[PDB]
């Protein structure tokens, strides 16, 4: 209850490899409506590589594992999301150097830095219709859980539920960043694929925390 271990982090990333494989066509379909129809394919391409690398590094510390993961996503995903998800994991990795276990306060700090990283690099604001429309509430959710002293598995179920609502909330937003914003008003009525990716990640983290 009290902490997330590195084995759980590894099991998290393994589950992200699976979700990005099964959800590939779905994510791509979301990206077909408002983009260049590639987001599922590219997330699967990057995450497949992540999970390939992971057995070799699974006995290492959390920082080194997140750093490989970020570095991998950074060069193998492509487009707008690759640099962003890579920055997330790289920033998380620098906060967790040598860690083998994280308290809920620490997990929250990790996500915070992660998210600051992606906002800083991509300059997205609330309502811009991007992945930051899920990251910001996710971080706020973990901060509240940390204050209330919730166990890690309950905290992570809460952030996962929040991630879902935040992804849903992107549907009615007009895109102001990335490829979708080319469509002007025509991006309204369609869920953002980057935001759906973050949700998937959070749902998988929630599962890994049970084990």
């Amino acid at each position: 209850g009290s902490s997330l271990s590195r084995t759980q982090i590894v099991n998290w990333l393994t589950r992200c490899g699976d979700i990005f494989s099964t959800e590939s066509e779905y994510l791509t379909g979301l990206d077909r409506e408002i983009g260049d129809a590639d987001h599922g394919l590219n997330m699967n391409r990057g995450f497949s590589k992540v999970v390939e690398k992971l057995p070799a590094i699974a006995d290492k510390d959390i920082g080194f594992i997140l750093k490989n993961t970020g570095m991998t996503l950074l060069s193998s995903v492509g487009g707008a999301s690759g640099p962003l998800f890579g920055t997330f994991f790289i920033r998380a990795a620098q906060a967790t150097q040598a860690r083998q276990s994280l308290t809920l306060e620490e997990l929250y700090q990790m996500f915070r830095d992660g998210a600051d990283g992606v906002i800083s690099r991509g300059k997205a604001e609330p309502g811009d219709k991007t992945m930051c429309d899920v990251w910001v509430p996710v971080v706020e959710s973990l901060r509240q859980s940390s204050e209330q002293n919730l166990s890690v598995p309950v905290a992570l179920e809460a952030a996962s539920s929040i991630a879902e609502s935040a992804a849903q909330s992107t549907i009615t937003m007009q895109a102001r960043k990335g490829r979708a914003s080319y469509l002007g008003e025509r991006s309204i009525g369609h869920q953002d694929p980057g935001a759906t990716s973050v949700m998937f990640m959070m749902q998988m983290l929630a599962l890994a925390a049970k084990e």
Binding site: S3, S5, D36, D38, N42, R45, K49, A56, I57, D59, K60, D61, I62, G63, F64, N68, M71, S75, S76, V77, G78, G79, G82, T96, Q97, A98, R99, Q100, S101
Partner: protein, 294 residues
């Protein structure tokens, strides 16, 4: 160019300027195997190429990744241009060796070892006189040829930035293979370090110039009654209270060998024989503390 002329002399032996036929094209299973063993360079190459296209569209051109044998592994770019090149036989798995299609950047880059451009009637085969090709070879983690990045376009639309673009992308994919291999090298050193720590006799605790615990083995963690997995990455000051003898030496960056020492772990006294090993680096001093078994 002497490079072209020399290439023409090789092509002259076995090949005519006006002929063109069905491609020599890897197929079904053998192709899947080529694709499979080129995975590392491919996935990196395909992301890079998608990006080059994105900031270039609209434009009549195509981008190719080829393996070290001039076999086309992936294509992207303008749909129409890709259909025209496909009509000439260039598809996934088509081999573009000089011995098959004549003098062309697609092969001459790897033959020459450098970024190369061929246009119009520099090409041996007349079928290619409407095309410009730029290509650059790319290299391993270990310095050998692993593939080629090329850009194909109608000869009248060539730009001066086409060649340096293939060069910069080949170098980027190259360096990315190198960074994958650097990370794998460090993982191998971490394995050495971890195996040493798990199998040795001494207890060990080690910390940063920033005060943060980097490693502790089972032996040190039972003796100093510290948590075996939650200590790492936390301030050593908030982990245990250090004796007077250590405190001095630690401030003074001064080594200690087989000296006696008394510790405190959450209100409790431990007696031990220790060694303190300073590690002096540009960024500050780090420490290793060994607890010798009595």
């Amino acid at each position: 160019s002497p490079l072209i002329a020399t290439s023409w002399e090789r092509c002259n032996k076995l090949m005519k300027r006006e002929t063109w036929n069905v491609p020599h094209q890897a197929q079904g299973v053998t192709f899947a195997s080529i694709y499979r063993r080129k995975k590392a360079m491919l996935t990196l190459g395909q992301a890079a190429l998608e990006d080059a296209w994105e900031y270039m569209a609209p434009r009549e051109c195509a981008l190719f990744i080829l393996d070290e044998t001039a076999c086309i592994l992936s294509r992207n770019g303008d749909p129409q241009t890709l259909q025209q090149l496909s009509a000439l036989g260039f598809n996934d798995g088509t081999y573009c060796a000089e011995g098959i299609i004549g003098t062309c950047a697609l092969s001459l880059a790897a033959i020459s070892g450098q970024a190369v451009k061929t246009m119009a009637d520099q090409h041996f085969k007349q079928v290619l006189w409407n095309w410009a090709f730029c290509a650059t070879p790319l290299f391993d983690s270990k310095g050998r040829l692993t593939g080629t990045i090329a850009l194909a376009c109608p000869v009248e639309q060539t730009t001066a930035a086409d060649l340096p673009l293939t060069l910069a992308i080949a170098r980027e994919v190259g360096n990315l293979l190198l960074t994958d291999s650097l990370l794998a090298e460090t993982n191998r050193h971490l394995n050495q370090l971890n195996a040493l720590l798990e199998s040795m006799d001494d207890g060990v605790i080690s910390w940063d110039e920033q005060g943060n615990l980097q490693f502790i083995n089972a032996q040190a963690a039972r003796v100093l009654r510290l948590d075996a997995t939650a200590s790492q990455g936390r301030a050593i000051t908030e982990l245990l209270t250090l004796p007077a003898v250590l405190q001095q030496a630690i401030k003074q960056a001064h080594p200690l060998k087989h000296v006696e020492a008394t510790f405190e772990s959450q209100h409790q006294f431990i007696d031990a024989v220790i060694t303190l090993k300073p590690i002096i680096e540009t960024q500050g001093t780090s420490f290793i503390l060994l607890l010798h078994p009595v």
